[model samples]
Target: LPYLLAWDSNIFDFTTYGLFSSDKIIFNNNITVTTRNMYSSSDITLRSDNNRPGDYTIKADNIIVKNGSFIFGGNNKVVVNNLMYTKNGITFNGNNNRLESNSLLFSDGTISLSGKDEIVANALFCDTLDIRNGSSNLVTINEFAYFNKLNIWTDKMVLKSNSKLFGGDIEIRNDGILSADVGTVVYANNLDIIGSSATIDAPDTVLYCNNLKIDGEVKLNVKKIVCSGTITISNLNSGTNIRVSDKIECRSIPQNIPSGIRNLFVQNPNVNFQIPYPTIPAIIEEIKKNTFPTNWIRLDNIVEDKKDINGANYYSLVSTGQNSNDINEIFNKNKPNNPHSNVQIFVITKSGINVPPDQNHLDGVLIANGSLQFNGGNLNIEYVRMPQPLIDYLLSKNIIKIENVQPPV
Candidate 1:
């Protein structure tokens, strides 16, 4: 069995007295660790892994836990107020912790852990959450929160682009706006979007929530969806395009429709439901020679990669290029005499192309001789019909379209 220990309310002035007395100590009122405040080393030992009950609150202007560990066991409650900073970092298992005027900043930290310390609060206000060196850290929130802006970097963490935040309930509160990068899975058991003009934009994102409700002026711009629960819209101004994986319940259309019912909620069956996957051609004479096209801006430094989505294995083409921003010139068009200039085409053979997380901007058409996978990037291509010029070119190479025309049966 683990040791039985817990920490309670204490205000320590580190600037005046300096370091903690010893490497390890408890913070109960009896210990009076804050009063003594003696010592001079920046390093403080971790409290033993144990369980203790009662509410513990630490009110400090600044608390820096460097390469240390703060673990509260049993049924304990710890509230961190003011400002708390961590570097190189310590093991902070505040499964049940709160960040208010008290801002939690992880120079490089994760968001998820076991022992399930769900953050519980009603209308909890967080100033900011800057996650650096972001990895697959699943941070669970039991209640709700309000924040200025939750900013996260794509590559700094290990969380998959399509992983859920938690299998339990999830909510987004605190100030009405949530922001995440592309190629990510924003998931939860239940998601409640609060506020008027409250917006959630995670482009190239997949949402998997048990229940989804949009309140006030909210707009959720995600690519795919897998909500097994009902999608309730409190206000008529909400809109969503959810691609359902399982049999999910959506609010049925009302009979007595009002005049201002303009929002559209579509239950798409495909994950990447926005883009209709093209059917692969029947035969390929020389697959290798035409793998990379010349005119449409290409990535030839190729590396084959494998990805599993919705339980299906797929081949992928990972680009070796470091920067995708610099290659935007390939999609430029010659408008005045433009027939093929502005138009771009991507042809994938056995493997599909994966736009790097670093490059979020993309345009033009991608023809996956296989499939097209977008990770954590933004793809803004205007879908259009195949131009007549490109149509004649394919026909010249004997790539004729096989019409589904059958004679008299």
Candidate 2:
């Protein structure tokens, strides 16, 4: 037993300094001490070792530290493989910084510990931050941005334009900023560009989410901005050649189906409305956000109404049953044997109402009478749902043909 100093009780051993011994180092002091077992809850100070370096390995089951800084040198390393907890302090990642532990290095609050030195083999698998002179200097990302469901946070980030940033869901507060170069693509549920501009240079980054709101102006280079929810775009100060991957909604458009646009597709009875003008496009693109199929008839411009079988017109049946089948649910499920039930129309922008003289007033018809506009405001609507068969009879007079293609096989 080489002078083992188990610091269980208070000791006043200040006679001499350490020369050599497996001393059980356990105490708080002002000057630095080179011992074997370092176990203390009190604060301690560690100075440089001849500008060279050494290391210390902690293999205990648990170690509780209060406050201080753990700086390593050239040949030094702190390897902890068990429970390690730091109330608050810094773990500077200096020369060859290596902290390989078997357990978690948890900091309840904030802990600043990083290095300006190069990394060797061992690494940090958590929020390893490097703060110098109160400024964020260098960061090491020898891994992915996210480990499992949890995401890592950094104040500033820089990436190449051709990089494909993919994630299921990611939210960055205004405090953090992501500067993406052109040709870079981002795939996520929703991107709330709160601020910081987070400049995006990518040309076509398909966005898929329930809702997307661009509070700040971002370069649009993607092909689609699909939102299973609602897409509220206030301004487009950037280029106009960009295509939205999902339904579009403007801060200026109040109606689900504007007046200037002839076609409207709104399935939600509560939010659906339309105006039937002779300007209705036989086949057009729908303007309603969320719940629009990508296909001909511009899935967005569909209007449903009760039928008046009295119209001497013939229509083909697309499907029957509960209409649960998503594709080709045409002809209506409850198409009472009378067949001459009701008619639905999907129009385009060409047949839009030229209101305000300059802008097109996109409007559509609403069934249940004024039921559609009741929730929004006091606006009148025309071209209600006509009797099914009779309405189909009129459609027989006008129909067009288009080209064919398919989705990425």
Candidate 3:
């Protein structure tokens, strides 16, 4: 029978007594200790062959595991009040395992937190911290932390204010969130952010990484960013000091980009500062050849004050709807007397179309033979895939001529 006996001010072997409150204690060879609180003045060594298969709950002022394997089996929990130092390594298995300490220093070895396990520490220094498995698993560091390699596959990792995380490589993937509060600093050699929901929310923070690759979405509001490799982003806020050695690639030109950026690359060259569309000829051809005819409706003589630019008349349509269906209905409802002419069409809306949470952006194809413009608000225009019937019609009319191809032998 493994029973917990309380000891105070006495030095005893933990394997026999199970619990002790002494100046120094050593755990050797298969010991299971479950106590409310443990007090140790010197270092507490969990020696080799002490791979116990039970919970060893320790609430001490300062605990040290120097040079040995402190592997806990089953649902074990370790709670340190002040600080914990591990020299060799520590592995926590089973579910509901938690390691809470004020400061944790793993000089050598890896701490793998999985199976709904969590680590809440004020400061941390580890070689490798792998947090995955359950969704409820979390690693919360308050002040400062350093890791050789930090990999977060699922759940959340939070860094509080005035915290600094210096790592060799940091990866946040598959619904993993690396959230940092104000005054937080993160320095990594390679930082990879993958998966749709994987995010790094670091506002008023400084991120210095050598190679930063974000294949998914991220809300980064950093004070300064210095990346050596290419940075591909969707949107960025103002007042961010960014210094990229390689190049900055984006889907479109982000708003409030600080001037004096040397290497900046927009995916679409035709997109200017304001207009997020291609040339009139290219857009018209794309829309006519691709978009379904029923998806768009026409409006004639809507704008009383029309402008003529470069020998072409510009027609404006004051549309109230934002979505494609609503705009089409509005165009169909307004039955004007004048016939359609060969002129440019400008679609005007009161407010911009708000992109839904699920979708990336609000997009559609406009089939204006002339030019297309948006006056009141912005609209994201993308090339829509042509239907089979439209493709067949274009093929029959020789609009899309097919060429013979040779198969590779």
My TM-score estimates for the predictions, one after another, are 0.28, 0.28, 0.46
In order, the Cα lDDT scores of the candidates are 0.33, 0.29, 0.46
- Each candidate structure's count of clashing pairs: 23, 49, 0
Task: Point out the higher-scoring one by lDDT: 1 or 2.
Answer: 1
> Lowest summed lDDT over 10 consecutive residues: which window, candidate 1?
1-10
Give the Å error, residue 23, model 2: 19
| Residue range 87-128, candidate 2, lDDT tens digits | 343354333334443423443333343433322111122223
Q: Which candidate is the best by TM-score?
A: 3
Q: How much is the lDDT of residue 226 in candidate 3?
A: 55
Expressed as tens digits, the lDDT of each residue in 1-409 for candidate 3 is: 0011111111111111112211234433333333323322233433222244444444444443333334544344567654455555556666566677764334356877656777888767677887766677878888666777888888778888887787778988887777788788787778877756676777666666666666533434445555654454434333144333334433344444445443443344332122111112221122224231112222221223112211233333333333445434323322233334323223333222222222211212222212222221111122223333433433453323333322211
Candidate 2: where is the Cα deviation over 4 Å? 1-143, 147-155, 158-190, 201-208, 219-226, 239-409
368, model 1: CA deviation in Å? 63
In candidate 3, what residue range of length 10 has the lowest lDDT sum?
1-10
The deviation in Å at residue 33 for candidate 1 is 17
Q: Per-residue lDDT of 64-110 in model 1, one digit per residue for the tens?
A: 33333343322233344332333223333433333322333222232
TM-score of model 2 vs. true structure: 0.28
